[PDB]
């Protein structure tokens, strides 16, 4: 079973509280994020540009 089933491409950082990185060689790279509004658990597509910027600001810092 993969940590994420469907990925959302219409999510923005303002609606996410934190991003979780998962390196699963059974499903490849997947990222899980929670909606700040209802604090739900949703899966975000690792192809969004703001996601890459978040990883870039967390890796250099």
Swiss-Prot record:
Outcome reported for the amino acid change (mutating residue 7 to A): No effect on anti-HIV-1 and chemotactic activities. Slightly impaired chemotactic activity and no effect on inhibition by heparin
Site (Important for integrin interaction and activation): 17, 20, 36
Outcome of substituting residue 53 to A: No effect on CXCR4 activation
Binding of heparin, residues: 13-23, 34, 41, 57
Phenotypic consequence of residue 36 to E: Loss of integrin activation
Record annotation: effect of changing residue 41 to N: Slightly impaired CXCR4 activation and clear resistance to inhibition by heparin
Effect of residue 34 to Q: Slightly impaired CXCR4 activation and clear resistance to inhibition by heparin
Highest taxon in the source lineage: Eukaryota
Disulfide bonds: 2-27, 4-43
Resulting phenotype, residue 18 to L: No significant effect on dimerization in neutral pH. Eliminates the pH dependence of dimerization
Name used for this protein in its record: SDF-1-alpha(3-67)
Source organism: Homo sapiens (Human)
Phylogenetic placement of the source organism: Eukaryota, Metazoa, Chordata, Craniata, Vertebrata
């Amino acid at each position: 079973r993969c940590p994420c089933r469907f990925f959302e491409s219409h999510v923005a950082r303002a609606n996410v509280k934190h991003l979780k990185i998962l390196n699963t060689p059974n499903c490849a790279l997947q990222i899980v994020a929670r909606l700040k509004n209802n604090n739900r658990q949703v899966c975000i597509d690792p192809k969004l540009k703001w996601i890459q910027e978040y990883l870039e600001k967390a890796l250099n810092k």
